[PDB]
Amino acid sequence: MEITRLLTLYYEATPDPQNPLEGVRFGTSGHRGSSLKATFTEAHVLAIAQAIAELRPSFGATGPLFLAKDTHALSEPAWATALSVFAAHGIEVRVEADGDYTPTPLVSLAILEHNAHHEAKADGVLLTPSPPEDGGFKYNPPTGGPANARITRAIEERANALLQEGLKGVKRLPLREALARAKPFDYAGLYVEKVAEAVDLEAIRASGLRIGVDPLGGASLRVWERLAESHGLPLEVVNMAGLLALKDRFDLAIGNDPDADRHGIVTPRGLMNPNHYLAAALHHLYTTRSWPGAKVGKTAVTSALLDRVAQALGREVYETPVGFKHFVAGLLEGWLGFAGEESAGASFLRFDGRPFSTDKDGILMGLLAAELMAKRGQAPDALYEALAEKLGRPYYARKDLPVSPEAKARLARLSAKEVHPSTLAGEPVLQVLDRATGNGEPLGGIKVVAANAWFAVRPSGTEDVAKVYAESFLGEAHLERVLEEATALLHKALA
């Protein structure tokens, strides 16, 4: 009674109209929850899909809608629900042709290629929670990436409005009919073809390397197999990358999560720290691509090693608040060559300089590790080693400080002016920020920055706790010194 109960609740459970916490909370990662908590039910999908069908035009999407779903249990029912209402709105929905699952970056690609050649722009709906065992509903506009706050805010309001009026305003069609309406689309077909213009597939097939790829039960199965059998890639499809280390008997092994927007890198030395791989990937990228006037994008809590890698390569960084959405415009327009988070997510531009995928691409990042080892005659983790030695070795850590429901609110109002220590673990504070250096947008929480270490602290949008991040290029002892002062300072301000 776990999975069967899980799907029965999706349909049998409904959110409490009077409980703001069970309604549609469309954020940076779309709407997420679980039927076990009544936070992700048929009710939620009907409202969000209805809302998107109504606001779609205003968002500038008049063409087809690319529908996808990952391997999460609740995604199955969601896909059915969404498809059913959209089809009832006459919108041309495009569903997976080969298989039933479509990784997030493939939808991103399908939208981009479409709007680059058609007037009636397309958008996309991805039913994926990211990842334990909960549902997710994400929207990607004609930009082909995570929707911005204006669009999410508008979806959320309408969804809750419909929900609040009992859904009497939702139009639906029976699955059977909707399905007869849907138009099959070869997502992977398009992927295998175009990815060749972002990654040197040639250099990989002639590398003599033995690359392993574990779809980890995710949705990247079909695309990996087709990438291998369509470019003659030396990669074995053997069904982040949790426990892919099972067999370090490959020259390199790639892993992807359910919607494959994230990646894990394994080598004989083991599983790479996400931040460390980004560092290496970044160096390899800006060392082989010609991206005139293209900055390096990253979130405020992303490793500063990327910062040091960019400087060493005469490249400028564009720091933003957490949320891959802040990179979308930058990638879509070409001024961001590489964009990544510390959460094992990233993407970069094709050679051309044009965008490949505006959302996080776990597949592209996996292929790159292969290309990196190929062209450089050096493993990715060994590249990180060379980077750490020359530019500085980062020590990252993060902790959560439980906070009283009242202090949690005080944290929300906290700003740079209230957090101004002259020192950080023995170093002169160079900056205190409450806005992202790249776009100047507020970043929710503050960041204290020193020459070799920095720390940030932001409120948890779910539970009453403060999320503190800290990094240092001076060692574990120093890193603890930073966390202590961070914690300390943090409580003084929330007192």
Place this chain on the structure above:
Amino acid sequence: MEITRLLTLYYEATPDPQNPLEGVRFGTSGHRGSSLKATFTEAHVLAIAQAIAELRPSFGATGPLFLAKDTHALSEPAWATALSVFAAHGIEVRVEADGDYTPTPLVSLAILEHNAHHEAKADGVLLTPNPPEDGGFKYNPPTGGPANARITRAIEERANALLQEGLKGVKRLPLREALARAKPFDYAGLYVEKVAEAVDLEAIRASGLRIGVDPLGGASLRVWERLAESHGLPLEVVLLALKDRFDLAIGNDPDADRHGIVTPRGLMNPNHYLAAALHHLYTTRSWPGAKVGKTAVTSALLDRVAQALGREVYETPVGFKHFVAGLLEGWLGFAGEESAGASFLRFDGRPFSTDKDGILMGLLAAELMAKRGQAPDALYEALAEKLGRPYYARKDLPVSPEAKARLARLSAKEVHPSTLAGEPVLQVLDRATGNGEPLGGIKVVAANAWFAVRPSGTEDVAKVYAESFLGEAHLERVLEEATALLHKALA
């Protein structure tokens, strides 16, 4: 995998109003179907639950309704749907207190036990089907056992009427609300205490035997573990029970109304086990005037065994429902069926379970080996040597859609040979010798062999059952003449 699809289709799919094959088909086994074929969907459950809610009064049930579900995926949502509807009608619904699943026999006991101490009689609803791909909805009246044809026919029409009118007449509650109104009931608890009134548990406890029990991922998991615990029974809970490191092993199907017996010699043929059980039962219980119940297709060894003990046989059409009344009123101490399903009376002549009880039969197999000092299969061997060894064959003959209709019109007149496999035909029947009700099909009886032919209710098939006490080669002659006779009559 295909399982999330199976459950999603339970809700996203519905039966076509213009196609009778997808409507409610409440037979002897209740309603069975699959969402993958729009034959078992929320529409179906909503319609049946609503039908039963409106008809319970006329069926004589004005008390609690015992709800239960097995381990079939489609049983989960069906439980939710049924509970919601029943709750909306103010019906007091009893649900599984321990674990989430509950075996058919355990519901039967609860009804019987309740109706023997209250005036507002109780009934039950079990959500169970068959393969993992489908589910079912069964109803057990105040009798405690499978509903008869009258009730079943009433449920079917009302349910299809609702479906035809889009379910406009279906009222329900949100699961959560219905769930709050649900009264938890400890099924296994009542079973563990009362079973000691039907089988000699002390004998098993002291037997020194090592028994193995394989619930097979079914709903009987809890009751078994609790039986071993509350009685000191040498039962180890774990038909692939093919891992004979026990003196005796037991298997049960999902809803536990069927049993499978395993000994170092292998898996006992269902019919054979029934023979052994029947003998041990009548050479051990004192059931004054209690006849032996069996279906027209169940092995004749049972007839011989009953004859050897001076007991009358009461043969009926297929369908355990034909034994309910007899078990309920005491005139039949044992009721068995070739499909590995049986039940019997309590030591004192009172009903224990009026429906098939794979747990009872399983416990009985151990009591048998404990009290007799011989395995169930060694007993069957002795009965076969003394009264005659049976050879049973089953065979489905696919028939054109046209013959399927002629088959349904076939009677004793059309199938009347003078001899069967070189033996004089004693009687040709199209009625059951016990009650006298049509057995739907025909049966040809010789002194040492017989064969029956009946229409499958689900597909264009004529089912042929043949048995001979003369060996393999002779069985082959019985089948052949049988299929030959069948084709000719359906030409």
